[PDB]
A = this chain, B = another copy of it.
Amino acid sequence: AAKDVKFGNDARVKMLRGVNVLADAVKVTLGPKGRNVVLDKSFGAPTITKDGVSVAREIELEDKFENMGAQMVKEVASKANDAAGDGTTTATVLAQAIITEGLKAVAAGMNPMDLKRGIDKAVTAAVEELKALSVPCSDSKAIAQVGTISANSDETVGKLIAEAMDKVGKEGVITVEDGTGLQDELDVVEGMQFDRGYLSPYFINKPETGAVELESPFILLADKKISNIREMLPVLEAVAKAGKPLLIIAEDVEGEALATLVVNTMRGIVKVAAVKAPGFGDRRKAMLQDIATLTGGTVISEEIGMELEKATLEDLGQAKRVVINKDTTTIIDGVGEEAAIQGRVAQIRQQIEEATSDYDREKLQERVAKLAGGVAVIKVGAATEVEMKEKKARVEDALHATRAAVEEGVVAGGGVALIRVASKLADLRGQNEDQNVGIKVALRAMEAPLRQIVLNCGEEPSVVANTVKGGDGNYGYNAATEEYGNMIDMGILDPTKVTRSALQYAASVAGLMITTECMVTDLP
């Protein structure tokens, strides 16, 4: 494949145009009074929406290079949401902001290396400011507080959320399942979770969630890497006639067996999916056992000669539910006997006796939690199935922000937070004058979001922005009501975490480009 290569401006310019489209197309949907975009559908009527994430999703340009520029942003803007639950759009909005100016500068003659530096500083600083401005969120009050707000005023919601964490704790594992009747339900059941994503997106059965929800399937707990499909045939056929799904946990899976399942499911008879096992090496040993214990399943160790072909359902584990996302597996309600489960706990507990290390003691501990801790669940109750699954959505949302709000507190959410922080460090200087500009850009870029909202609401950006600078603290303008005040009291906020994330990620990608001198790709 002969490539097409561009340098300096030629390169950067393309990337710029590229990004812009993305931004210009996704930014118009920002405020609570955002405009809408039309996403043409292949089959049928087009789709109208104001959801930037969706918009962004569809964006892909013909001009490679320009297209790269776009994808480069989308990527990190996604990562932002990935690690905060929102911002996806905002990050993009800022991303442009920076890139645009900083990219004129480089092209104006100014040194890029510094520009980047200047910015990073600005960010770095503002990030602190954010920490300052942030308002703690600890008590079940603060908790239900934010919840209901992010749940859109709905108090019942924030409520459960607070109750929840009040049960399995703030770090506890909470989940959501459609309600069976009209009543909401909160139950705590033997469960567990760990960071480990599916080995194939083609496993997803919940497109809008990019997740995989399975119904009380069986569970496999291998001890080797699974490359060849042969070993499965026995069990794989057992669960086939068992009429239930099946989850797998082991070292890993080579396409041979992997690529097969993927297809075997994506429009195939038995539909199942699998994910690596948590921890590595000596750790994993126990780690998987804990799981066995909990799911009442048998662990197939080759270090025991027991092979996969040598395995029947009696050897599998089982839970009532289980979901997987891009990088996290969690199981609900393990059939494992309390006698068994609890006992295991004793075992471990004991083991923590050695305490030969605050790492080993900390490790055993962590397992104790996962296993003894449990997983709390919720069942969004509702009248109609619509409101039902709808409500269920808002919930999962709120839950997010809340965890975040908890982690890093919260701040003014109309893009306010940024405006504030900016006006703060408005003197902040750098060595090279090229760094000052670097800083300006950064700062002036933080005005973007707000200005954009105002704009999308058909209001005067410059004007609103100004008066917002005047005030202090979480004093801002509520675009949705056109009334200024305490954005937070007015129930308009953003988990400190996300705002930061967004801003950092944008800065990240920005300098990244500002320092890019070459671009390679295929020929048209």
Could you list which residues of chain A lie within 8 angstroms of chain B, going by C-beta atoms?
1-5, 7, 11, 15, 21, 24-25, 28, 33, 35-40, 42, 44-46, 48, 55, 58-62, 64-65, 67-68, 71-72, 74-75, 111-114, 178-182, 215, 225, 227-228, 230-231, 243, 254-256, 259, 267-271, 279-283, 307, 359, 383, 385, 388, 457-458, 512, 515-523
Contact = CB atoms under 8 A, between A and B. Distances in A.
Contact of A113 (B3, B33, B38, B39): B33
Q: With a 10 A CB-CB cut-off, give which of A74, A269, A518 has the most chain B CB atoms.
A: A518
Q: With a 10 A CB-CB cut-off, give which of A46, A178, A279, A519 has the most chain B CB atoms.
A: A46
A170 to B, nearest CB: 23
A44 B114 CA distance: 31
A480 to B, nearest CB: 13
Given A38-B518, A458-B113, A45 B21 contact: no
B280 A38 contact: no
Q: With a 10 A CB-CB cut-off, give which of A40, A44, A59 has the most chain B CB atoms.
A: A40
Given A3-B61, A458-B112, A68 B38 contact: yes
Contacts of A227: 271
A359 B383 CA distance: 9
A388 B280 contact: yes
A40 B227 CA distance: 30
Given A60-B1, A228-B243, A243-B228, A281 B37 contact: no
A46 B61 CA distance: 13
A74 B62 contact: no
A259 B64 CA distance: 37
B71 A522 contact: no
A46 B458 CA distance: 36
A28 B489 CA distance: 51
A504 to B, nearest CB: 16
A156 to B, nearest CB: 16
Given A68-B46, A228-B243, A35 B517 contact: yes
A53 to B, nearest CB: 14
A225 B271 CA distance: 13
Contacts of A67: 2
B62 A516 contact: no
B180 A281 contact: yes
A36 B388 CA distance: 47
Contacts of A259: 267
29 contacts: A1-B60, A2-B61, A3-B58, A3-B59, A3-B62, A4-B62, A35-B515, A36-B512, A37-B517, A39-B521, A40-B68, A44-B71, A45-B74, A46-B72, A48-B72, A55-B520, A58-B520, A59-B520, A113-B457, A178-B280, A180-B281, A180-B282, A181-B282, A181-B283, A228-B270, A231-B243, A243-B307, A256-B268, A280-B385
Nearest to A22: B5
Contacts of A307: 243
B228 A269 contact: yes
A62 B520 CA distance: 13
A457 B61 CA distance: 33
Contacts of A256: 267-269, 271
B181 A281 contact: yes
